[PDB]
Structures are given as structure tokens and as C-alpha cells.
């Protein structure tokens, strides 16, 4: 509410403890549910990657 | 070679807490219980409604201390009248006095108890 952009709820793995992390990214146009996004230096050039 | 920090947070270490071992009591003697049984049971109610409760519901109606709960009223009635009671209902009157309806156990007759108390 109050924002024109959709928000993407994205679930990662905590690399240090057994848990699932939930982030609230700003949805880039094209991404869909069930899609894998990759965040990091070695990530590739795809829509939604960071 | 074994002191390790697997967490990046420093928490306050758990120290020893002693229990109080005072060198003198702050109160010389414990103050006695003012809300004893005679304080709890002030006087019975002798109105038309109270009499009808005695002769119908096996219930004695009392005016009790406003600070006494149902357990205290039950135990006080049991001790200072030598009767067994089933349940206690309690209201506070519009004048501020607490009223207790004490139903007696089936083997006790509230009429006879009221006669021994002297409130018939």
C-alpha cells in the first residue's frame, strides 16, 4: 500500500545456521513465483539477479 | 587452545548471586493476621430473603469482610461453626458490605445450624 511497485518475497538459506531467510526485494519486471534469483559477485546477468 | 568464540556477540557472563543472609530481621516479629475467622464472619443476615434461603436452598447468608475470598469464607464457616459447606456464592452489596451465600453439605441442615447460631 502506498507504493506503485510490487514487492517480491524472496527466500534464501542462512549460510551459518539452519534457517530460512525472507527478504522483501523490489520486484523487477519479469520475475515470477518459483523463480530462482542469485545475489552475489559471481551471479549472472539475468533479470532479478543482484 | 580451547577458549573459542563461535558467536559474534559478547553476552554478559553469568555471575554468582547470593541469597540474603541478613544480620538482623527488619521486623522484630511477624505482625499477626488481622483477617482471622472472627474478622471474616461479621454477622449473619436475618432478612426475609435470608430466611427463605435457609429453608429452601440449605444456605446460610452472612455478612463477611470485603477482603475475604470464597476459600477464606468457606474455611472460616467450617472452623467456627463445625459444619461442612458445599459452595460459597459472593456478592458485594450497594452499601459496600460483602454478602456470602454459603450452601451447606447435604448431611447438614441449615435450619438446625441457624437455630444453634441463634438467628432463627
Amino acid at each position: 500500500p502506498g507504493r506503485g511497485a510490487p514487492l517480491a518475497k524472496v527466500v534464501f538459506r542462512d549460510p551459518y545456521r539452519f534457517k530460512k531467510r525472507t527478504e522483501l526485494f523490489i520486484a523487477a519486471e519479469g520475475i515470477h513465483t518459483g523463480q530462482f534469483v542469485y545475489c552475489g559477485k559471481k551471479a549472472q546477468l539475468n533479470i532479478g539477479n543482484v | 587452545k580451547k577458549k573459542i568464540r563461535t558467536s559474534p556477540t559478547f553476552r554478559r557472563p553469568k555471575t554468582l548471586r547470593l541469597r540474603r543472609q541478613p544480620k538482623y530481621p527488619r521486623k522484630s516479629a511477624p505482625r499477626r493476621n488481622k483477617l482471622d475467622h472472627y474478622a471474616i464472619i461479621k454477622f449473619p443476615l436475618t432478612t426475609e430473603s435470608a430466611m427463605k434461603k435457609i429453608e429452601d436452598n440449605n444456605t446460610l447468608v452472612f455478612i463477611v469482610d470485603v477482603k475475604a475470598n470464597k476459600h477464606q469464607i468457606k474455611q472460616a464457616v467450617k472452623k467456627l461453626y463445625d459444619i461442612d459447606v458445599a459452595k460459597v456464592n459472593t456478592l458485594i452489596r450497594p452499601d459496600g458490605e460483602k454478602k456470602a451465600y454459603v450452601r451447606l453439605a447435604p448431611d447438614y441442615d441449615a435450619l438446625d445450624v441457624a437455630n444453634k447460631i441463634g438467628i432463627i
Binding site: 538459506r13 542462512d14 549460510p15 551459518y16 545456521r17 539452519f18 552475489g40 | 573459542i4 568464540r5 563461535t6 558467536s7 559474534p8 556477540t9 559478547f10
Partner: protein, 241 residues
């Protein structure tokens, strides 16, 4: 040969995104309490900043051999404890009632302690060796002592531990101690100490006066400066020759 076939290795790899990281040592990356951070940062600041020579001279102290041998000499001259004083006072009272009289009986040489006592002894030139702790926290109690001892000619040294000097004088912490006259059997040991102390402290007082401290950068800064220097050096080397 007889090992159970059901036993097998189950190696886990700790690459990125794979099996979660093991519980490893994280002391370097701990959110420490403010007081721990403050004392460590103060230790770092005393290495960053240009420390004046009058404060920097206390970082030069005795080595293990000389400090231990000096403390061994000084252990023979510890001040008497309260129990020892009360017992010699009782013995003195009984023997005085017996007929011993005053009889000063050569009050034994003792170790004088305390900065005011020691500085008065130094001013009167009644001190034969001064030992100064290196870690007096309000360090103005001692900054004048090396220069004063040099001017008066009394040999002085700096030792590691106001706590060690305190244990020498049966207290928690002593700033400085002084050797007044010493016993005949210990005169040789005191002279042997005083000569090395004199060479290491009073003789080189002129360069102690000028030896500034600190002014050293952190390991990261030093390393990156070194790698920049090496880059320019290697390109210059390929240029030359």
C-alpha cells in the same frame, strides 16, 4: 580388514551455498563491550600517535635477566610486614623491660617505596639505585624521575610492573622503589646491577631525550603501501637494465 562395511566417510564441503559453515573462531569479529573496545583502541592510539620522548622512555625497560636479578636482590630488603613489626615491637617491649634500654641495634637497610619518598631521596643524593615502574596510569608521577635521577647522578632503571613492585612492598601497586645503603654481602650484587643500569639508562640519556615513539601505521596500511611500492619498483626494474 574386519571393519564394519556400513562405516563410510560423510565429508561435507563448506563452499559458498553448500553445507552450512562450521562453528569457527570469530574472536576477531566480535561486537566487544565498550570498555574492551576503549582499552584496545587506546593501545592502538599509543602506537599511531607520535609519543613524546618523556613518555616513550618508559617503554624501554629491563630485560628478563636483569629484571629478575634486580628483583632477587630487592627481595632481601622488603619492608617488614605488620605481623613482623608487631612481633618485634612485643620483643622490644619485653627486652626493654628486662634492661636492654634504647639500643638502636643498627636499624637494618630497607627498600624505600613511594614516589615522594624516592624523589626526596634522589634530591638529597641518598639513593643508590632507583627502580621505576613502566605502567603508572596517571603518568606524571614519574615523567620527571629519569631526568631528575640523571641530573642528580643516581642510577635509575625502568622495570615492567607496578604490580611487581607492589608485591615487593606488600601492597597492590608501587610506583617506584629506591635502594638506600645495602648490606656488605650484597654490595657486590648492587654494584654489578648499577653498572649495567648506568650504561643502559644514564649514559644514553641524551638519545633517550630525543627518541620519539609511536608513529607506526596499522598492518593493513603498511601492507598496501608496501604493495604500491613493490608495483612501482617492479615496473621501474623492467624499465631499467
Amino acid at each position: 580388514k574386519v571393519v564394519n562395511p556400513l562405516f563410510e566417510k560423510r565429508p561435507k564441503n563448506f563452499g559458498i551455498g553448500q553445507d552450512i559453515q562450521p562453528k569457527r573462531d570469530l574472536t576477531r569479529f566480535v561486537k566487544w563491550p565498550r570498555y574492551i573496545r576503549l582499552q584496545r583502541q587506546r593501545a592502538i592510539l599509543y602506537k599511531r600517535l607520535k609519543v613524546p620522548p618523556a613518555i616513550n622512555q618508559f617503554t624501554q625497560a629491563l630485560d628478563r635477566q636483569t629484571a629478575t636479578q634486580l628483583l632477587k636482590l630487592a627481595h632481601k630488603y622488603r619492608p617488614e610486614t605488620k605481623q613482623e613489626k608487631k612481633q618485634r615491637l612485643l620483643a622490644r617491649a619485653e627486652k626493654k623491660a628486662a634492661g636492654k634500654g634504647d639500643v638502636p641495634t643498627k636499624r637494618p637497610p630497607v627498600l624505600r617505596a613511594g614516589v615522594n619518598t624516592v624523589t626526596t631521596l634522589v634530591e638529597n643524593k641518598k639513593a643508590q639505585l632507583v627502580v621505576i615502574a613502566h605502567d603508572v596510569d596517571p603518568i606524571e608521577l614519574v615523567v620527571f624521575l629519569p631526568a631528575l635521577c640523571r641530573k642528580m647522578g643516581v642510577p635509575y632503571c625502568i622495570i615492567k610492573g607496578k604490580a611487581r613492585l607492589g608485591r615487593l612492598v606488600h601492597r597492590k601497586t608501587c610506583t617506584t622503589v629506591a635502594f638506600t645503603q645495602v648490606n656488605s654481602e650484597d654490595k657486590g650484587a648492587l654494584a654489578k646491577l648499577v653498572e649495567a643500569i648506568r650504561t643502559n639508562y644514564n649514559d644514553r640519556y641524551d638519545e633517550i631525550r630525543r627518541h620519539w615513539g609511536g608513529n607506526v601505521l596499522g598492518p593493513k596500511s603498511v601492507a598496501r603501501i608496501a604493495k604500491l611500492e613493490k608495483a612501482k619498483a617492479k615496473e621501474l626494474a623492467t624499465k631499467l637494465g
